Amino acid sequence: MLIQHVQELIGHTPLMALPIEVPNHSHIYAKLEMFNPGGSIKDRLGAYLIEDGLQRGRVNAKTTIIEPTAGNTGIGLALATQAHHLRTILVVPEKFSMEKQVLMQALGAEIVHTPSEEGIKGAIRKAEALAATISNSYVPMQFKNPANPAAYYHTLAPEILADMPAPITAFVAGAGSGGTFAGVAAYLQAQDSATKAVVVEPEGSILNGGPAHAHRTEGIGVEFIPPFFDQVRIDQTLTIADNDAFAQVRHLARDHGLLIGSSSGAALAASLQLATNLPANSHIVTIFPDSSERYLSQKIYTK
Amino acid sequence: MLIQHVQELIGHTPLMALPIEVPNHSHIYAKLEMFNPGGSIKDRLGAYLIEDGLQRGRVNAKTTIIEPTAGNTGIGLALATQAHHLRTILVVPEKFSMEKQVLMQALGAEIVHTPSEEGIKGAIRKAEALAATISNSYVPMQFKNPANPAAYYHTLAPEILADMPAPITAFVAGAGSGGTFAGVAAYLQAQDSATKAVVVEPEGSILNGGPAHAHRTEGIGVEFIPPFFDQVRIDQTLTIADNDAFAQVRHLARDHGLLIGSSSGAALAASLQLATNLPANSHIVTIFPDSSERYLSQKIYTK
């Protein structure tokens, strides 16, 4: 309990056996990643992306770290770069996640804005363009960098097995970049090929041949199929309505004091659904990426 | 790290040896209470206040808990009442802490508003009146109930000694209700009379013969003399300008990734001040009650 840097608090997050009603007398466990010092699972990503960059000789003491982000990655990365005294520029769409931007700046990151209408795609393009005007720079590029899934494969995944009281029937996680799901699933399946890996997507994702539109659930959603899915035997993709996600957000807070983000609600709603189609007395593990407190300005507990 | 309830995460918070410049080569350690499930040190108080109410035979399964609160206590209490299935009514000034009210309601508490101009004094009066209209009710009354300092005396205080690598030269804490300071100090001093107890207050409090005005530092501040101070040998009272408190908020986040509330900044500023007048190589311990994330809607990192 005596620490010297907030970095010591990254990882080793609680695995909570949810005291809720589950179909077929089964059980759902969730990794509470909001307890990371940065408030999200991305604290793990940032640290590893920088370590990987340093290990691959792509980063040096005076290097400028440049990364396109729509949320939590900016915070997690800023935490790690500040630990390494690395200059940081984060490219984020104009009005995306206000609270996250304040945090990104409070941690020392300098922000450059790209048009909201262009989304992450625009941010990615400007990040690359800016990298071209700065000789000593590095773009982690979270959406294509294999170090992304690798970050959870060697940390989060093993932590799950160390706390589980039984074999994992199925792993369930939402996909934004797909790093979390792909990294953990690969490790879990490598340990027990029997473990089912199920990916979750919000309203309006193309991962399940659905229509491409804007969703309420913040954090997840895929434009193009993540390249990381190669190392996983995806047994099923579930699509969750915002209605269900936010209902879970409201229910978990009201009944159990769990303040989870909308993507957490989506992961729980998906886990509950999977429970109805798996053998009884099954053990399902999911991940709660961040808190709801980071979305209070978005009336997350309303309607 | 398998848990079944969020309450298992209350307490046993980290003690951080701040890696910052301290006068006279001394050292400042801070209890990071924002890592409690409810986001603040009040998770400790809520639990204890309800346990104490049950033990004194003042609360039964059907009792309606009614408490006047202008912040985190409402959250910490709602968490505790939830665990015991206790109906909860929180009386809070109209526009006091937007973010905190959302959480209070998300956790199942029913809120009753009192005019903002009346302050906590108004909420207290209404809490007692409401109590008078409900036969089976209980008013913890955090401002007068000795179970308040008791909450920290038996948990937080011992936790500090268990992590301290050396004897505590001075203990520093901000006083709102005075519970945290009085409870911890009384325990530390009981263990070692040599330990100095120092109270901190935002500019505009009576604790130091100062005037009476509103301050930017949220969560702390004294109207009348807290009754809890009788169990402490207060060695000094420090008044901190808002400019100093918020400076520390900005600095700790920018340099160390520590997202702290304004009252935390005031406590660090006081601790740094104390360091300049204590022998060299001294060991100072203080408390960081909550995070800054809970004040993003108030431009806590601005100006």
Coordinates of C-alpha atoms in Angstrom, one line a residue:
Chain A
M1 CA 0.0 0.0 0.0
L2 CA 3.0 2.4 0.3
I3 CA 3.6 3.6 -3.3
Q4 CA 5.8 6.3 -5.0
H5 CA 4.0 6.7 -8.3
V6 CA 0.4 6.3 -9.5
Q7 CA 1.9 3.9 -12.1
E8 CA 2.2 1.4 -9.3
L9 CA -1.6 1.3 -9.2
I10 CA -2.1 0.3 -12.8
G11 CA -3.4 -3.2 -13.3
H12 CA -4.2 -5.9 -10.7
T13 CA -7.8 -4.7 -10.9
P14 CA -10.6 -6.4 -9.0
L15 CA -12.5 -9.3 -10.6
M16 CA -16.1 -9.0 -9.3
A17 CA -18.5 -11.9 -9.2
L18 CA -21.6 -9.9 -10.0
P19 CA -24.3 -10.6 -7.3
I20 CA -27.1 -10.4 -9.9
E21 CA -29.7 -12.6 -11.4
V22 CA -28.1 -14.6 -14.3
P23 CA -29.9 -16.9 -16.8
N24 CA -29.6 -20.7 -16.1
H25 CA -28.0 -20.3 -12.7
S26 CA -24.8 -19.1 -14.3
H27 CA -22.2 -16.6 -13.2
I28 CA -20.8 -13.3 -14.7
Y29 CA -17.5 -11.9 -13.5
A30 CA -16.3 -8.5 -14.5
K31 CA -12.8 -6.9 -14.4
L32 CA -13.3 -3.4 -12.8
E33 CA -10.9 -1.5 -14.9
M34 CA -12.2 1.9 -13.8
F35 CA -10.0 1.5 -10.7
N36 CA -6.9 2.2 -12.7
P37 CA -5.4 5.6 -11.7
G38 CA -6.4 7.0 -15.1
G39 CA -10.0 5.8 -14.6
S40 CA -9.9 3.2 -17.4
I41 CA -8.3 0.1 -18.8
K42 CA -6.4 2.4 -21.3
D43 CA -3.9 3.1 -18.5
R44 CA -2.6 -0.4 -19.5
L45 CA -2.5 0.4 -23.2
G46 CA -0.6 3.7 -22.9
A47 CA 2.1 2.2 -20.7
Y48 CA 2.7 -0.7 -23.1
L49 CA 2.6 1.3 -26.3
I50 CA 5.3 3.6 -25.0
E51 CA 7.4 0.7 -23.7
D52 CA 7.0 -1.0 -27.1
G53 CA 8.0 2.2 -28.8
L54 CA 11.1 2.5 -26.7
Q55 CA 12.0 -1.2 -27.1
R56 CA 11.7 -1.0 -30.9
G57 CA 14.1 2.0 -31.0
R58 CA 11.3 4.2 -32.4
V59 CA 11.4 6.6 -29.4
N60 CA 14.1 8.6 -27.6
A61 CA 14.2 11.1 -24.8
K62 CA 13.3 14.1 -27.1
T63 CA 10.8 12.3 -29.3
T64 CA 7.3 13.8 -29.7
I65 CA 4.5 11.3 -29.2
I66 CA 1.6 11.8 -31.5
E67 CA -1.6 9.9 -31.3
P68 CA -5.2 10.1 -32.7
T69 CA -7.8 9.4 -29.9
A70 CA -11.5 9.9 -29.2
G71 CA -11.2 9.2 -25.5
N72 CA -9.5 7.1 -22.8
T73 CA -6.4 6.2 -24.9
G74 CA -5.4 9.9 -24.7
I75 CA -5.5 9.8 -20.9
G76 CA -3.7 6.4 -20.5
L77 CA -1.0 7.5 -23.0
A78 CA -0.6 10.9 -21.4
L79 CA 0.0 9.1 -18.1
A80 CA 2.7 6.9 -19.5
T81 CA 4.4 9.7 -21.6
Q82 CA 4.6 11.9 -18.5
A83 CA 6.2 9.0 -16.6
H84 CA 8.9 8.9 -19.3
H85 CA 9.1 12.7 -19.6
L86 CA 8.0 12.4 -23.3
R87 CA 6.5 15.3 -25.1
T88 CA 2.9 14.5 -26.2
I89 CA 0.5 15.7 -28.8
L90 CA -3.0 14.2 -28.9
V91 CA -5.2 14.7 -32.0
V92 CA -8.9 14.4 -31.1
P93 CA -12.2 15.3 -32.9
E94 CA -13.4 18.8 -31.8
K95 CA -16.3 18.0 -29.5
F96 CA -15.6 14.4 -28.6
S97 CA -15.6 13.6 -24.8
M98 CA -15.2 16.9 -23.0
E99 CA -14.3 15.6 -19.6
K100 CA -11.6 13.3 -21.2
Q101 CA -10.1 16.3 -23.0
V102 CA -9.7 18.3 -19.8
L103 CA -8.0 15.3 -18.2
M104 CA -5.8 14.8 -21.3
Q105 CA -4.6 18.4 -20.9
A106 CA -4.3 18.3 -17.2
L107 CA -1.8 15.4 -17.7
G108 CA 0.4 17.6 -19.9
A109 CA -0.8 16.5 -23.3
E110 CA -1.1 19.2 -25.9
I111 CA -4.3 18.8 -28.0
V112 CA -4.9 19.5 -31.7
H113 CA -8.5 19.4 -32.9
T114 CA -9.9 17.9 -36.1
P115 CA -13.5 18.3 -37.4
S116 CA -16.2 16.4 -35.5
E117 CA -17.9 15.4 -38.8
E118 CA -14.7 13.5 -39.7
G119 CA -14.5 11.5 -36.5
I120 CA -11.5 9.3 -35.7
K121 CA -10.7 8.9 -39.4
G122 CA -9.9 12.6 -39.6
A123 CA -7.9 12.5 -36.3
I124 CA -5.9 9.6 -37.7
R125 CA -5.1 11.6 -40.9
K126 CA -4.0 14.7 -39.1
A127 CA -1.9 12.7 -36.7
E128 CA 0.0 11.2 -39.6
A129 CA 0.3 14.6 -41.3
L130 CA 1.6 16.2 -38.1
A131 CA 4.1 13.3 -37.7
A132 CA 5.4 14.3 -41.2
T133 CA 6.2 17.8 -40.0
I134 CA 8.2 16.7 -36.9
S135 CA 11.3 14.7 -37.6
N136 CA 11.7 13.2 -34.2
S137 CA 8.2 11.8 -33.7
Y138 CA 6.3 8.6 -33.1
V139 CA 2.7 7.6 -33.7
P140 CA 1.7 4.6 -31.6
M141 CA -1.2 4.1 -33.9
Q142 CA -3.4 2.2 -31.5
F143 CA -5.8 1.0 -34.3
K144 CA -3.2 -1.0 -36.1
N145 CA -0.3 -1.5 -33.7
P146 CA -0.1 -5.1 -32.4
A147 CA 1.3 -3.8 -29.2
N148 CA -2.3 -2.9 -28.4
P149 CA -3.7 -6.4 -27.9
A150 CA -0.3 -7.4 -26.5
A151 CA -0.8 -5.0 -23.6
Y152 CA -3.7 -7.0 -22.2
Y153 CA -2.5 -10.4 -23.3
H154 CA 0.4 -10.2 -20.8
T155 CA -1.3 -8.4 -18.0
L156 CA -5.1 -8.3 -17.8
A157 CA -5.6 -11.8 -19.2
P158 CA -3.3 -13.6 -16.7
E159 CA -4.9 -11.6 -13.9
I160 CA -8.3 -13.0 -14.9
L161 CA -7.1 -16.6 -14.6
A162 CA -5.4 -15.9 -11.2
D163 CA -8.7 -14.8 -9.7
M164 CA -11.3 -17.1 -11.4
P165 CA -12.7 -19.7 -9.1
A166 CA -13.6 -22.0 -12.1
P167 CA -12.8 -22.6 -15.8
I168 CA -14.0 -19.8 -18.1
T169 CA -17.0 -21.0 -20.2
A170 CA -16.9 -17.8 -22.2
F171 CA -15.1 -14.4 -22.5
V172 CA -17.2 -11.4 -23.5
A173 CA -15.9 -7.9 -24.3
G174 CA -16.9 -4.9 -26.4
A175 CA -14.7 -3.9 -29.3
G176 CA -13.6 -0.4 -30.3
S177 CA -10.1 -1.0 -31.7
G178 CA -10.6 -4.7 -30.8
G179 CA -7.4 -4.7 -28.8
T180 CA -8.8 -5.7 -25.4
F181 CA -11.0 -8.5 -26.7
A182 CA -8.3 -9.9 -29.1
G183 CA -5.5 -9.7 -26.5
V184 CA -7.4 -11.3 -23.6
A185 CA -9.2 -13.9 -25.8
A186 CA -6.0 -15.0 -27.5
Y187 CA -4.4 -15.6 -24.1
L188 CA -7.4 -17.3 -22.6
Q189 CA -8.0 -19.6 -25.6
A190 CA -4.3 -20.4 -25.6
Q191 CA -4.6 -21.6 -22.0
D192 CA -7.9 -23.4 -22.7
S193 CA -9.1 -23.8 -26.3
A194 CA -12.5 -24.7 -24.9
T195 CA -13.1 -21.0 -23.8
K196 CA -15.6 -19.3 -26.1
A197 CA -14.7 -15.8 -27.2
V198 CA -17.6 -13.5 -27.9
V199 CA -17.2 -9.9 -29.2
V200 CA -19.7 -7.2 -28.4
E201 CA -20.7 -4.2 -30.6
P202 CA -22.9 -1.1 -30.0
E203 CA -25.9 0.1 -32.0
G204 CA -24.7 0.8 -35.5
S205 CA -21.5 -1.3 -36.0
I206 CA -20.5 -3.1 -39.2
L207 CA -18.9 -6.1 -37.4
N208 CA -22.2 -7.9 -37.6
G209 CA -23.4 -6.8 -41.1
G210 CA -25.5 -4.1 -39.4
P211 CA -26.2 -0.5 -40.5
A212 CA -23.5 2.1 -40.0
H213 CA -24.7 5.0 -37.9
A214 CA -24.0 7.0 -34.7
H215 CA -24.6 5.2 -31.3
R216 CA -25.1 6.4 -27.8
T217 CA -22.8 3.8 -26.2
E218 CA -19.5 5.6 -25.8
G219 CA -16.1 3.8 -26.3
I220 CA -16.9 0.9 -28.6
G221 CA -18.0 0.5 -32.3
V222 CA -16.0 -0.6 -35.3
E223 CA -15.7 1.0 -38.8
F224 CA -13.5 -1.6 -40.4
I225 CA -12.8 -5.1 -39.1
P226 CA -10.0 -4.8 -36.5
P227 CA -6.8 -6.6 -37.7
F228 CA -6.3 -8.1 -34.2
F229 CA -9.1 -10.5 -34.6
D230 CA -6.7 -12.8 -36.5
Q231 CA -5.4 -14.4 -33.3
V232 CA -8.9 -15.3 -32.0
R233 CA -11.5 -18.0 -32.7
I234 CA -14.5 -15.7 -32.4
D235 CA -17.4 -17.9 -31.5
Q236 CA -20.0 -15.2 -31.7
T237 CA -20.6 -11.4 -32.2
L238 CA -23.4 -9.8 -30.2
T239 CA -25.0 -6.5 -31.1
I240 CA -26.4 -4.5 -28.2
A241 CA -29.0 -1.8 -28.2
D242 CA -28.3 1.5 -26.3
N243 CA -31.5 0.8 -24.4
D244 CA -30.0 -2.3 -22.9
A245 CA -26.6 -0.9 -22.2
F246 CA -27.8 2.2 -20.4
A247 CA -30.4 0.1 -18.5
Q248 CA -27.5 -2.0 -17.1
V249 CA -25.7 1.2 -16.2
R250 CA -28.7 2.3 -14.2
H251 CA -29.4 -1.1 -12.6
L252 CA -25.8 -1.8 -11.5
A253 CA -25.6 1.6 -9.8
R254 CA -29.0 1.4 -8.1
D255 CA -28.6 -2.1 -6.8
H256 CA -24.9 -2.6 -6.3
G257 CA -23.1 0.7 -6.2
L258 CA -21.2 0.0 -9.4
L259 CA -20.6 3.1 -11.4
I260 CA -19.9 1.8 -14.9
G261 CA -19.7 3.4 -18.3
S262 CA -22.2 2.7 -21.1
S263 CA -19.8 0.3 -22.8
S264 CA -19.8 -1.7 -19.5
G265 CA -23.5 -1.9 -19.6
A266 CA -23.3 -3.2 -23.1
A267 CA -20.8 -5.8 -22.1
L268 CA -23.0 -6.9 -19.2
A269 CA -26.2 -7.0 -21.3
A270 CA -24.3 -9.1 -23.8
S271 CA -23.0 -11.4 -21.1
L272 CA -26.6 -11.8 -19.7
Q273 CA -27.8 -12.7 -23.3
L274 CA -25.0 -15.2 -23.8
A275 CA -26.0 -16.8 -20.5
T276 CA -29.4 -17.8 -21.9
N277 CA -27.7 -19.8 -24.7
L278 CA -24.9 -21.5 -22.7
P279 CA -25.2 -24.5 -20.5
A280 CA -26.5 -23.8 -16.9
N281 CA -23.9 -23.1 -14.2
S282 CA -21.6 -21.5 -16.7
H283 CA -18.9 -19.0 -15.9
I284 CA -18.7 -15.9 -18.1
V285 CA -16.0 -13.3 -17.8
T286 CA -16.4 -9.7 -19.1
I287 CA -14.6 -6.3 -18.8
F288 CA -15.9 -3.0 -17.5
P289 CA -13.5 -0.5 -19.2
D290 CA -14.4 2.7 -17.4
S291 CA -16.7 4.6 -15.0
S292 CA -19.9 6.5 -15.5
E293 CA -18.5 9.5 -13.6
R294 CA -16.7 10.3 -16.9
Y295 CA -20.0 10.8 -18.6
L296 CA -22.0 12.7 -16.0
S297 CA -22.0 15.7 -18.3
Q298 CA -23.7 13.4 -20.8
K299 CA -26.7 12.5 -18.6
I300 CA -25.7 8.9 -18.5
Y301 CA -28.1 8.0 -15.7
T302 CA -31.0 9.9 -17.3
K303 CA -34.0 8.7 -19.4
Chain B
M1 CA -8.5 -10.1 -6.2
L2 CA -11.9 -11.7 -6.5
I3 CA -14.7 -9.8 -4.7
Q4 CA -18.5 -10.1 -4.5
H5 CA -19.4 -6.5 -3.4
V6 CA -18.1 -3.0 -4.1
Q7 CA -17.9 -2.5 -0.3
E8 CA -15.0 -5.0 -0.2
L9 CA -13.1 -2.2 -2.0
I10 CA -13.6 0.5 0.7
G11 CA -10.5 1.4 2.7
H12 CA -7.0 0.1 2.6
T13 CA -6.3 3.0 0.2
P14 CA -2.7 3.6 -0.9
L15 CA -0.4 5.9 1.0
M16 CA 1.8 7.7 -1.5
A17 CA 5.2 9.1 -0.7
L18 CA 4.9 12.2 -2.9
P19 CA 7.9 12.4 -5.4
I20 CA 7.9 16.2 -5.2
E21 CA 10.2 19.0 -3.9
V22 CA 9.6 19.4 -0.2
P23 CA 11.2 22.1 2.0
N24 CA 14.1 21.1 4.3
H25 CA 14.6 17.7 2.5
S26 CA 11.4 16.4 4.3
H27 CA 8.8 14.0 3.0
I28 CA 5.0 14.2 2.5
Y29 CA 2.8 11.1 2.3
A30 CA -0.8 11.3 1.2
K31 CA -3.7 8.8 1.7
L32 CA -5.3 8.5 -1.7
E33 CA -9.0 8.2 -0.6
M34 CA -10.3 8.8 -4.1
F35 CA -9.7 5.2 -4.8
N36 CA -12.7 4.1 -2.7
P37 CA -15.5 2.7 -4.7
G38 CA -17.6 5.8 -4.1
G39 CA -14.8 8.0 -5.2
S40 CA -14.1 9.6 -1.8
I41 CA -13.1 9.1 1.8
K42 CA -16.8 9.3 2.7
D43 CA -17.3 5.7 1.7
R44 CA -15.7 5.0 5.1
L45 CA -18.0 7.4 7.0
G46 CA -21.3 6.2 5.4
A47 CA -20.6 2.6 6.3
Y48 CA -19.6 3.4 9.9
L49 CA -22.6 5.8 10.5
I50 CA -25.0 3.0 9.4
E51 CA -23.2 0.3 11.4
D52 CA -23.3 2.6 14.5
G53 CA -26.9 3.4 14.0
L54 CA -27.8 -0.3 13.8
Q55 CA -25.7 -1.1 16.9
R56 CA -27.3 1.6 19.0
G57 CA -30.7 0.2 18.1
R58 CA -31.8 3.3 16.3
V59 CA -32.3 1.7 12.9
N60 CA -34.3 -1.3 11.7
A61 CA -35.0 -2.9 8.4
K62 CA -37.8 -0.5 7.6
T63 CA -36.1 2.7 8.9
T64 CA -35.9 5.7 6.6
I65 CA -32.3 7.2 6.8
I66 CA -32.4 11.0 6.5
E67 CA -29.2 13.0 6.2
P68 CA -28.3 16.7 5.4
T69 CA -25.3 16.7 3.0
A70 CA -23.6 19.1 0.6
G71 CA -21.4 16.5 -1.1
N72 CA -19.6 13.2 -0.8
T73 CA -21.3 12.1 2.4
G74 CA -24.5 11.6 0.5
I75 CA -22.6 9.3 -1.9
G76 CA -20.8 7.3 0.9
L77 CA -24.0 7.0 2.9
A78 CA -26.1 5.9 -0.1
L79 CA -23.6 3.2 -0.8
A80 CA -23.9 1.9 2.8
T81 CA -27.7 2.2 2.9
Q82 CA -27.9 0.3 -0.4
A83 CA -25.9 -2.6 1.2
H84 CA -28.4 -2.8 4.1
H85 CA -31.5 -2.2 1.9
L86 CA -32.3 0.9 3.8
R87 CA -34.6 3.6 2.4
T88 CA -32.7 6.8 2.0
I89 CA -33.5 10.5 1.8
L90 CA -30.7 13.0 1.4
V91 CA -31.4 16.7 2.0
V92 CA -29.0 18.9 0.0
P93 CA -28.9 22.7 -1.1
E94 CA -30.4 23.2 -4.5
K95 CA -27.4 23.7 -6.8
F96 CA -24.6 22.3 -4.6
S97 CA -22.4 19.8 -6.5
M98 CA -24.1 18.8 -9.7
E99 CA -22.1 15.7 -10.3
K100 CA -22.5 14.5 -6.8
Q101 CA -26.3 14.7 -6.9
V102 CA -26.4 12.6 -10.0
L103 CA -24.4 9.9 -8.2
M104 CA -26.5 10.2 -5.1
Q105 CA -29.7 9.5 -7.1
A106 CA -28.0 6.8 -9.2
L107 CA -27.3 5.0 -6.0
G108 CA -31.0 5.0 -5.1
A109 CA -31.2 7.9 -2.7
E110 CA -34.2 10.2 -2.9
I111 CA -33.2 13.9 -2.8
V112 CA -35.0 16.8 -1.2
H113 CA -33.8 20.3 -2.0
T114 CA -33.4 23.3 0.3
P115 CA -32.5 26.9 -0.9
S116 CA -28.9 27.4 -1.9
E117 CA -28.7 30.6 0.1
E118 CA -29.4 28.7 3.3
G119 CA -26.4 26.4 2.8
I120 CA -25.8 23.3 4.9
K121 CA -27.6 25.0 7.8
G122 CA -30.8 25.0 5.8
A123 CA -30.4 21.3 4.8
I124 CA -29.8 20.4 8.5
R125 CA -33.0 22.1 9.6
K126 CA -35.1 20.4 6.9
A127 CA -33.5 17.1 7.6
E128 CA -34.8 17.4 11.2
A129 CA -38.2 18.6 10.2
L130 CA -38.6 15.7 7.7
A131 CA -37.4 13.3 10.4
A132 CA -40.3 14.7 12.6
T133 CA -42.8 13.7 9.9
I134 CA -41.5 10.1 9.6
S135 CA -41.9 8.0 12.7
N136 CA -39.4 5.2 11.8
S137 CA -36.5 7.4 10.8
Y138 CA -32.8 8.0 11.7
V139 CA -30.7 11.1 11.2
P140 CA -27.0 10.1 11.3
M141 CA -26.2 13.8 11.7
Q142 CA -22.6 13.7 10.5
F143 CA -21.8 17.2 12.0
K144 CA -22.5 16.2 15.6
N145 CA -22.4 12.4 15.7
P146 CA -19.1 11.2 17.3
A147 CA -19.4 8.1 15.1
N148 CA -18.0 10.4 12.4
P149 CA -14.4 10.7 13.7
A150 CA -14.7 7.1 15.0
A151 CA -15.0 5.9 11.4
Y152 CA -11.5 7.0 10.6
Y153 CA -10.0 6.4 14.0
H154 CA -10.4 2.6 13.6
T155 CA -9.7 2.3 9.9
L156 CA -7.8 5.0 8.1
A157 CA -5.6 5.9 11.0
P158 CA -4.2 2.4 11.7
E159 CA -3.8 2.0 7.9
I160 CA -1.4 5.0 7.9
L161 CA 0.8 3.6 10.6
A162 CA 1.0 0.3 8.8
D163 CA 2.4 1.8 5.7
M164 CA 4.6 4.6 7.2
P165 CA 8.3 3.9 6.7
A166 CA 9.1 6.2 9.6
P167 CA 7.6 8.0 12.6
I168 CA 5.0 10.7 11.8
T169 CA 6.4 14.1 12.5
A170 CA 3.1 15.9 11.7
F171 CA -0.4 15.0 10.6
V172 CA -2.2 17.4 8.3
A173 CA -5.8 17.3 7.1
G174 CA -8.5 19.7 6.0
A175 CA -11.6 20.2 8.2
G176 CA -15.1 20.3 6.9
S177 CA -17.0 18.6 9.7
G178 CA -13.7 18.0 11.3
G179 CA -14.3 14.3 11.5
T180 CA -11.3 13.1 9.4
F181 CA -8.8 15.2 11.2
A182 CA -10.1 14.6 14.7
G183 CA -10.5 10.8 14.2
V184 CA -7.1 10.2 12.6
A185 CA -5.2 12.7 14.8
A186 CA -6.6 11.3 18.0
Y187 CA -5.4 7.8 17.0
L188 CA -2.0 8.9 15.8
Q189 CA -1.3 11.0 18.9
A190 CA -2.6 8.2 21.1
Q191 CA 0.1 6.0 19.5
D192 CA 2.7 8.7 19.7
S193 CA 2.1 12.0 21.6
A194 CA 5.0 13.5 19.7
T195 CA 3.0 13.6 16.6
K196 CA 1.8 17.1 15.8
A197 CA -1.8 17.5 14.5
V198 CA -2.4 20.4 12.1
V199 CA -5.8 21.5 10.9
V200 CA -6.2 23.1 7.4
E201 CA -9.0 25.5 6.3
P202 CA -9.8 27.4 3.1
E203 CA -9.6 31.2 3.1
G204 CA -12.8 32.4 4.7
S205 CA -13.3 30.3 7.8
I206 CA -13.6 31.0 11.5
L207 CA -11.1 28.3 12.6
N208 CA -8.4 31.0 12.4
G209 CA -10.1 34.2 13.5
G210 CA -10.5 34.9 9.8
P211 CA -13.5 36.6 8.1
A212 CA -16.6 34.9 6.7
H213 CA -16.9 34.5 3.0
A214 CA -17.3 31.9 0.2
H215 CA -14.2 30.0 -1.0
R216 CA -13.4 28.1 -4.2
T217 CA -12.1 25.1 -2.2
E218 CA -15.1 22.7 -2.3
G219 CA -15.8 20.0 0.4
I220 CA -13.9 21.7 3.2
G221 CA -14.5 24.8 5.4
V222 CA -15.8 25.4 8.9
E223 CA -18.9 27.5 10.0
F224 CA -18.9 26.8 13.7
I225 CA -16.2 25.0 15.8
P226 CA -16.5 21.2 15.3
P227 CA -17.1 19.4 18.6
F228 CA -14.7 16.6 17.6
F229 CA -11.6 18.7 18.3
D230 CA -11.8 18.0 22.0
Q231 CA -10.0 14.7 21.4
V232 CA -7.0 16.3 19.7
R233 CA -4.1 18.4 20.8
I234 CA -4.2 20.7 17.8
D235 CA -0.7 22.1 17.4
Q236 CA -1.6 24.5 14.6
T237 CA -4.3 25.7 12.2
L238 CA -3.4 26.8 8.6
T239 CA -5.5 28.9 6.2
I240 CA -4.9 28.3 2.5
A241 CA -5.7 30.6 -0.3
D242 CA -7.7 29.1 -3.1
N243 CA -5.0 30.1 -5.5
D244 CA -2.6 27.8 -3.7
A245 CA -5.0 24.8 -3.4
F246 CA -5.9 24.9 -7.1
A247 CA -2.2 25.4 -8.1
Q248 CA -1.4 22.1 -6.3
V249 CA -4.3 20.5 -8.2
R250 CA -2.8 21.6 -11.5
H251 CA 0.8 20.7 -10.5
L252 CA 0.2 17.2 -9.2
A253 CA -1.8 16.3 -12.3
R254 CA 0.7 17.7 -14.8
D255 CA 3.8 16.3 -13.1
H256 CA 2.6 13.1 -11.5
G257 CA -0.8 12.0 -12.9
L258 CA -2.5 12.6 -9.6
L259 CA -6.1 13.7 -10.2
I260 CA -7.0 15.4 -6.9
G261 CA -9.8 17.6 -5.6
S262 CA -9.3 21.2 -4.5
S263 CA -9.4 20.2 -0.8
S264 CA -6.5 17.8 -1.5
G265 CA -4.5 20.6 -3.1
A266 CA -5.3 22.8 -0.1
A267 CA -4.0 20.0 2.2
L268 CA -0.8 19.6 0.2
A269 CA -0.2 23.3 0.1
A270 CA -0.6 23.3 3.9
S271 CA 1.8 20.4 4.3
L272 CA 4.4 22.1 2.1
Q273 CA 4.0 25.2 4.2
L274 CA 4.4 23.1 7.4
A275 CA 7.6 21.6 6.0
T276 CA 9.3 25.0 6.0
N277 CA 8.9 25.3 9.7
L278 CA 9.5 21.7 10.9
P279 CA 13.0 20.1 11.4
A280 CA 14.7 18.8 8.3
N281 CA 14.1 15.2 7.2
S282 CA 10.6 15.4 8.7
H283 CA 7.8 13.0 7.8
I284 CA 4.4 14.6 7.2
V285 CA 1.2 12.7 6.5
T286 CA -1.9 14.2 4.9
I287 CA -5.2 13.0 3.3
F288 CA -6.5 13.5 -0.3
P289 CA -10.3 13.1 0.2
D290 CA -11.4 12.9 -3.4
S291 CA -10.6 13.3 -7.1
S292 CA -10.8 16.3 -9.5
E293 CA -12.9 14.3 -12.0
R294 CA -15.8 15.1 -9.7
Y295 CA -15.4 18.8 -10.4
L296 CA -14.7 18.9 -14.1
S297 CA -18.0 20.7 -14.6
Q298 CA -16.5 23.4 -12.4
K299 CA -13.4 24.1 -14.4
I300 CA -11.1 22.7 -11.6
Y301 CA -8.1 22.7 -13.9
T302 CA -8.9 26.1 -15.4
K303 CA -7.3 29.5 -14.6

